[PDB]
Structure 1
């Protein structure tokens, strides 16, 4: 039965008054009949006097005062498990594609505590991505956060699709994609690019886009996360994509200003760091399973000091930057080896050979970076015959970072390659010390492992 009544409505914020003894607890979900359809309200505060203040997970137009409100006794619950693969959902777990119901056996609340201290894994492993640039220059910690910083046209979404493919096929995990606050168009022509690549059967999509009320854009990141947590509890390894964490922070600021709390550092809510932490703290490697996150980060005003980036970066373990220039040079994936970083590049955690190989190729490329500007102005003739060999090797290292993805076949017909880590370490140990100086640079381009680079070189 319905035991409450709406008492105020101001934009997205609805105040309802309950009996003195039956007040909903915070984060509980209410629902009202907004005319011809139901609307769900998530509680935020218990003002005194039986009243409680809530945010509508939808449009609030048409809400009269005095409507009846039905108090559900539990937080927002969403469907989880295998049944949600290949489907699309909005925050509240309703199917938002046209395929009909979800036959899920189980539903979970989206608010829960992070893994307690002694549940965490007593180890520190690497997620083998199968991509040369990533696995060499910016390895992924299994159960860590990764920030993907490139812009547009550089291939962010094809990178994400290749990661989905590799984590589902070569390992035996699933993936979740939470589209926080981004263009509807991109969500549509991402969903389509994934169905025509047959990865759609291994990823579960949830969408809250720019057109949604603040209550939708805010919590959607927790729905995807609480599906990934279900896959984790089944003992799997999961990969969780957040389409823009900055818009998560911004939906938090909008809701905060709606509730009327004082602003803090640069207009951001007072609870910025906690709203971020209670999300980023559920993405970890428990003894049973892992969640690994790949999070597209937008940095406002090109400022790495603004409180939003300054908070996000405190949680990221790796950082891969995509570059327009490396793309125009025709190398794909267009990762930037110099700006990409990972705090797993330490001899202790990755070993000495991997470490010093990555460091070597980095120094090679960053000398070439200036030899190229010598050449630009003085011409190739001026260089020492040491630097001409440095250039000839830098160009081959640069080529060897290219790779054919299983998902890129559509574009280039070449069958995609999965490059185990050992092969990358060997390939670069090789090139960097003159071995394979005897074969041309185009024999490295788009090849795969080096034990295929030679066999391509054989028949140019």
Structure 2
């Protein structure tokens, strides 16, 4: 129907003369060196030309070849037919079974549910993680976010969350890796196929290896599935690896899309690009969505725009700092900068709350004393403050615990702590019960009764 006019990386613009100027968000194909190549219309540039983004390698596109325009925004299957296996950003079967698939189909571009159509509950779910359950809980129909620089266990943390709540689930899960390592995805598929739990999950993979187009759209093709499952069946889980990889993709493009750069070279549309996608995930009257997601923080800067703006869109926000990892605590959660909107007394009971804020306080009071200690030594503290740091350093390493998924690369066998025990232990240490025990007694153990038994060996 039309022809190429320019080609700049992922951005190619097409001339289509008036008759059929493609609708703003709309697909269209191109024959390159060999195979089909879907472009997505992005901007109706003036003069009958149109900006698009290659949903594949833009390499090998001639400056003049014809391109056919269809009316379909994006072709992605939805429903129980998808549960089987892995999908593309285009909704293609990336795995080795020609999909039986769709009884229906939806566009990856959708609207956020109506305000009055939005629901919410307070039925808290219990993760195995001691830090998370105590410091920041969430009810089903919640938005959890894992912030962390590179190499802070970002992935392994999500996978442990998954193995813990994808069991109590008894429902339909929708994992959607985006901008991640492919090696993890292959293992997650094989690992989950042996446990036979694939038939209730649904994969979709836009790799960090794939071109820009695939990444900033695969996040959408991901949840548009969870949305279908929502608008029918009620309880769905939605796991997303690196929402950042999606925003980051949109940045590699923003230059070629020809808009001025915002702060730190980001797109001026960061505010909305995030909100659109992030506003889609919610508990409808018809069905709720529980969702955790690994939001990357560039160069460790929590002030960097991606994290900064992403914060508001989360119910519970647990953050992993490199400082806490550099110690040995490998649920590397900073219990101070990490919070939830539902650490409310009326919601989580008073015992959980008082224990949480108690633990929070003494741990913060310790951060203050940390300065004078380093300059003038321990022997300068009052006998009371002396006890504060000692009790704190117990808490500081009782927060730790070995993950099952993490057994592979560390000898330590995994453990799983009751939300009940998490309270019993910390409340306990704070009362001053388990003082006599050395610090190492608390480092990397399950319930407090493990800290006790470890103290015996040493």
TM-score by length of 2: 0.84
Change (3 A) 1:63 1:385: closer
Q: Distance in 2 between matches of 1:447 and 1:310?
A: 33
Change (3 A) 1:116 1:396: same
Q: Distance in 2 between matches of 1:64 and 1:411?
A: 48
2:40 to 42, 64, 82: 42
**What stretches of structure 2 of length at least 5 have no aligned partner?**
none
Q: Distance in 1 between matches of 2:104 and 2:21?
A: 27
Q: Distance in 2 between matches of 1:419 and 1:374?
A: 35
Change (3 A) 1:260 1:386: closer
Task: Report the alpha carbon displacement of residue 356 of structure 1 after superposing the two structures with TM.
Answer: 1.9
Task: Report the alpha carbon displacement of residue 65 of structure 1 after superposing the two structures with TM.
Answer: 5.5
String of CA shifts for 1:91-146, please: whole Å, max 9, x gaps: 11223344554645443211111111122115445343231101111223543433
Task: Report the alpha carbon displacement of residue 358 of structure 1 after superposing the two structures with TM.
Answer: 1.1
Change (3 A) 1:409 1:199: farther
Contact 1:146 1:317 (C-alpha < 8 Å) held by counterparts: yes
Change (3 A) 1:7 1:438: closer
Task: Report the alpha carbon displacement of residue 255 of structure 1 after superposing the two structures with TM.
Answer: 2.9
Q: Distance in 2 between matches of 1:300 and 1:379?
A: 35
Task: Report the alpha carbon displacement of residue 332 of structure 1 after superposing the two structures with TM.
Answer: 3.1
**What stretches of structure 1 of length at least 5 have no aligned partner?**
none
String of CA shifts for 1:24-62, please: whole Å, max 9, x gaps: 322221123324211112122334565544222122344
Contact 1:181 1:208 (C-alpha < 8 Å) held by counterparts: yes
Change (3 A) 1:432 1:283: same
Task: Report the alpha carbon displacement of residue 9 of structure 1 after superposing the two structures with TM.
Answer: 4.4
Q: Distance in 1 between matches of 2:252 and 2:54?
A: 13
Q: Distance in 2 between matches of 1:248 and 1:138?
A: 26
Change (3 A) 1:393 1:102: farther
Q: Distance in 1 between matches of 2:321 and 2:299?
A: 18
1:246 counterpart = 2:244: yes
Equivalenced residue count is 458
String of CA shifts for 1:282-326, please: whole Å, max 9, x gaps: 111222333344333344566555544443233233332223443
Change (3 A) 1:427 1:233: farther
Contact 2:158 2:294 (C-alpha < 8 Å) held by counterparts: no
Root-mean-square deviation over aligned CA pairs: 3.6
Contact 2:158 2:293 (C-alpha < 8 Å) held by counterparts: no
Change (3 A) 1:276 1:457: same
SS at structure 1 position matched to 2:244: helix
Task: Report the alpha carbon displacement of residue 66 of structure 1 after superposing the two structures with TM.
Answer: 5.6
SS at structure 1 position matched to 2:392: helix
Q: Distance in 1 between matches of 2:274 and 2:215?
A: 14
Task: Report the alpha carbon displacement of residue 219 of structure 1 after superposing the two structures with TM.
Answer: 0.8
